[PDB]
């Protein structure tokens, strides 16, 4: 009954099957990329249905199936949130990943390790799915670190190239700088609101203080390549073109903006953090556009364009219009 | 070959024999700490018609 | 060993505590009692030292 939960879980489940089959026989043939592409397309077509049901009715739901552990008065359970944001962002990401994998089936035909490349792409997609549909801060952190590790692994695809290793380490460094603020926010929320779940966080903080929002903004700036920690996004273009097209262009780099979107009931209650995030977005978008105005490498120009767009959606967050930022995403 | 593999594989029983010996020792050592059996203020229970001791 | 550890009997009394809490909350909500009591031990049994200062 109510197929919303069943289908919304089933898309994320079917996205995992080729990872399980990676040790089977099909992994050793040339049929694997087509298998992964077909799996992604089927997952997208299946996830298209909850979007229709939400559009018809306005369907929202959270599922807490597996109860991981209880620490005194705190419970950690594998809980997924299937609100408008997740149920709308899943099909877009799946569609883009399907197109990118079909393109990669032609771009990377000469790579001996193409099956491993497709497996890494699927792992990144699974981790981004985890991050998007997360409901408690710990699952969000799981996805947050998984996407960073996948970006590290895919940036340095060519191990012989020294610049690839340098860029991967640089991206990891900046993402850890963001994770500092993420961990600060997580600790503050647990120690003050006594829960990592978004529901209790939203109830218990009518006037959220400066520190947790500061930490969240720092993490969003770290992962969304804002002005303070921008260069990792332009320098992450040492990876293969499909990786840059999928990870560091449209899906992985919007994780910080998505995090700021998710905590919008708390951002409204504070006026200083809104000012700071608006200023950060404005300065970073102008700086990256000005840098792109004179670049000579095409991938560099598109990377700086991505950075400018991320700055624009951060500005959108600054003026208290999170839904418009989601639309722009 | 019987009585020949024993001269080479008699050592494999040492650990299992010691494990059984240790279980017996644990039971014997437990038998000396029955000074409060069925006398605790919380688990005090009336014996069944066919039980002699609450636990061994 | 992993299967044995997974199916270890609940000696930590996690379900027992949940059932006891359910019964306590139901009883205290039915009769209007104020759920948790701020005093762990009843004041009557406790004897205080009179200062008279």
């Amino acid at each position: 009954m109510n197929p919303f939960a069943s289908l919304t879980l089933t898309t994320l489940t079917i996205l995992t099957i080729p990872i399980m089959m990676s040790n089977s026989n099909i992994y050793k043939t040339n049929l694997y990329p087509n298998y992964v592409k077909t799996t992604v397309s089927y997952a997208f077509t299946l996830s298209l249905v909850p979007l229709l049901m939400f559009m018809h009715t306005g369907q929202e739901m959270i599922i807490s199936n597996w109860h991981w552990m209880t620490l005194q008065t705190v419970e950690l359970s594998l809980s997924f949130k299937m609100d408008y944001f997740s149920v709308m962002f899943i099909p877009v990401a799946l569609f883009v990943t399907w197109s990118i994998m079909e393109f990669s089936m032609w771009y990377m035909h000469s790579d001996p390790f193409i099956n491993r490349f497709f497996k890494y792409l699927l792992l990144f997609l699974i981790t981004m799915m985890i991050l998007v549909t997360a409901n408690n801060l710990f699952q969000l952190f799981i996805g947050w670190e998984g996407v960073g590790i996948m970006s590290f692994l895919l940036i340095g695809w060519w191990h012989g190239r020294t610049d690839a290793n340098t860029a991967a380490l640089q991206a990891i460094l900046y993402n850890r700088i963001g994770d500092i603020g993420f961990v600060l926010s997580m600790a503050w929320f647990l120690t003050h609101s006594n829960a990592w779940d978004l529901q209790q966080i939203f109830m218990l903080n009518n006037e959220c203080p400066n520190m947790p929002l500061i930490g969240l903004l720092l993490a969003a700036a770290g992962k969304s390549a804002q002005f303070g920690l921008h260069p990792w996004l332009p320098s992450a273009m040492e990876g293969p073109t499909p990786v840059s097209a999928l990870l560091h262009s449209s899906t992985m780099v919007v994780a910080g903006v998505f995090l700021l979107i998710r905590f919008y009931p708390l951002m409204e209650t504070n006026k200083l953090v809104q000012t700071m995030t608006l200023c950060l977005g404005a300065i970073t978008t102008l700086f990256t556009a000005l840098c792109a105005i004179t670049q000579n490498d095409i991938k560099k120009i598109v990377a700086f364009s991505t950075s400018s767009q991320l700055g624009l959606m951060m500005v959108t967050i600054g003026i208290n219009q999170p839904h418009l930022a989601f639309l722009h995403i | 070959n019987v009585l020949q593999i024993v001269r080479d594989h008699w050592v494999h029983i040492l650990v299992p024999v010691g494990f059984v010996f240790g279980c017996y020792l644990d039971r014997r050592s437990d038998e000396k700490l029955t000074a409060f059996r069925n006398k605790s203020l919380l688990f005090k229970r009336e014996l069944r018609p066919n039980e002699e001791v609450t636990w061994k | 060993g992993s299967t044995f550890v997974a199916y270890l009997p609940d000696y930590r009394m996690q379900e027992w505590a949940r059932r006891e809490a359910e019964r306590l909350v139901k009883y205290r909500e039915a009769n209007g009692l104020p759920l948790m009591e701020s005093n762990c031990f009843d004041p009557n049994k406790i004897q205080l030292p009179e200062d008279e200062d």
């Binding site: - | - | 049994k45 406790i46 004897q47 205080l48 030292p49």
Partner: protein, 121 residues
């Protein structure tokens, strides 16, 4: 403790007569087993030093080592148990004979005892 000058002590007696009033240690006492193990270790070390097959050079010698160690361990355990029994007997007798120095404590209940509470923050 210094029970050397204890009255009514035979100068050179290993086990006084009153020591026969105590239960003798069982032949399966763990300490006796440890004496046997020490004797076996001594036998193995003797075999090793003389450059002989360590485990199976002299069975009679190892048996004699174990038996002598067990004998001395048994008698030593008897003497030790007697001495500890004497110590406890003297302690209880002296406590009984001097009630002034060992007054009965006024029993108290935690309900009427004020202990300082140091919070952890």
């Amino acid at each position: 403790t210094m029970m050397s000058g204890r009255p009514g002590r035979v100068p050179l007696q290993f086990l006084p007569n009153e020591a026969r009033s105590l239960p003798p240690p069982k032949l399966t006492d763990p300490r006796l087993v440890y004496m046997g193990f020490l004797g076996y270790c001594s036998g193995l070390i003797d075999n090793a030093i003389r450059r002989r097959p360590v485990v199976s050079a002299g069975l009679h010698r190892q048996l004699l080592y174990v038996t002598s160690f067990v004998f001395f361990g048994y008698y030593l355990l008897k003497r030790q148990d007697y001495m500890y029994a004497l110590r406890d007997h003297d302690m209880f007798a002296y406590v009984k004979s001097h009630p002034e120095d060992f007054p009965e404590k006024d029993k108290k209940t935690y309900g009427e005892i004020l202990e300082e509470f140091h919070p952890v923050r």
